[PDB]
Amino acid sequence: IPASEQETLVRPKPLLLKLLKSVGAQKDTYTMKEVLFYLGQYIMTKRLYDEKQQHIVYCSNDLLGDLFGVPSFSVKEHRKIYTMIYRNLVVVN
Amino acid sequence: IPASEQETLVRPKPLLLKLLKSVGAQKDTYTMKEVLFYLGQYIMTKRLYDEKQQHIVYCSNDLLGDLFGVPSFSVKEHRKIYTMIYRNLVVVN
Numbered sequence: 001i002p003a004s005e006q007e008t009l010v011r012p013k014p015l016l017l018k019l020l021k022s023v024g025a026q027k028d029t030y031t032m033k034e035v036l037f038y039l040g041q042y043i044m045t046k047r048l049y050d051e052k053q054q055h056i057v058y059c060s061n062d063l064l065g066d067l068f069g070v071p072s073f074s075v076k077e078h079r080k081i082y083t084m085i086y087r088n089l090v091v092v093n
Numbered sequence: 094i095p096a097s098e099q100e101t102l103v104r105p106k107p108l109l110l111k112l113l114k115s116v117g118a119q120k121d122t123y124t125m126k127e128v129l130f131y132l133g134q135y136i137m138t139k140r141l142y143d144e145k146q147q148h149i150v151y152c153s154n155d156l157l158g159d160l161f162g163v164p165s166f167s168v169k170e171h172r173k174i175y176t177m178i179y180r181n182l183v184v185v186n
């Protein structure tokens with residue numbers, strides 16, 4: 001399917017869903033951009049980014065660290081982030 | 094996104110949508126498989142397939158012929174069919 005005519009939906013696993021809904025999300029399926037929107041909000045509101053180095057997220061004491069399995073990560077490393085998110089998506093076949 | 098965790102939706106243009114709804118479809122977005130399900134039904138119910146050569150669809154006197162722009166096509170030629178369907182999908186970006 002041509003990328004222009006195509007809408008792609010993902011279904012977060014229970015823990016990611018609870019996180020997304022904790023910042024105002026209502027539904028069960030999302031585009032990746034929508035998941036990123038809410039994850040961005042979560043990070044901002046819990047002030048997980050380092051004020052001095054605003055590209056590193058420190059999440060070791062937060063549920064995000066559980067979901068992602070790392071104590072911290074760089075927002076500049078997109079593919080790593082997508083990988084971490086994919087681990088929290090329901091296989092729908 | 095891993096293909097297993099991914100649901101892809103398309104939005105039929107007005108004429109295809111009217112065709113899909115003419116055979117029981119209710120919604121505005123569909124997976125490709127869902128569009129194919131309803132197109133298959135349309136073809137069966139209007140008996141557009143050739144009883145003697147059941148792989149050729151004759152649609153020149155039908156709205157399907159307008160949508161697809163051909164007087165007939167083979168069901169064995171999948172990529173041609175997908176191409177014809179893509180012309181009837183709303184670009185959603």
Ligand SMILES: C[C@@H](c1ccc(Cl)cc1)n1cnc(-c2ccccc2)c1-c1c(C(=O)Nc2cccnc2N2CCC(N3CCCOC3=O)CC2)[nH]c2cc(Cl)ccc12
Pocket residue numbers: 036037038039040041043044049054055075076077078079081082
């Ligand atoms: C391109 C984007 C990103 C997308 C995809 C990927 Cl893979 C990576 C980055 N981005 C860039 N900086 C952050 C990001 C970075 C740090 C903390 C939070 C979000 C993000 C981000 C968003 C997001 O929706 N961003 C966004 C989208 C559109 C416009 N503007 C955006 N940003 C708002 C906060 C803004 N910001 C950052 C801290 C300093 O002040 C400030 O205004 C910096 C600009 N969502 C995320 C989810 C996670 Cl897990 C991690 C990072 C993000």
Ligand SMILES: C[C@@H](c1ccc(Cl)cc1)n1cnc(-c2ccccc2)c1-c1c(C(=O)Nc2cccnc2N2CCC(N3CCCOC3=O)CC2)[nH]c2cc(Cl)ccc12
Pocket residue numbers: 129130131132133134136137142147148168169170171172174175
């Ligand atoms: C794999 C499939 C197809 C998919 C994708 C693509 Cl690209 C091409 C073929 N298929 C194969 N034969 C026809 C197809 C062929 C001719 C007429 C109508 C549908 C179709 C079909 C379906 C569909 O959903 N098929 C289907 C799906 C699942 C199980 N069984 C299925 N079929 C029911 C009618 C069945 N059949 C055909 C006539 C003789 O009696 C009979 O029982 C032959 C078996 N939808 C369509 C839409 C269009 Cl525009 C054109 C053809 C089809």
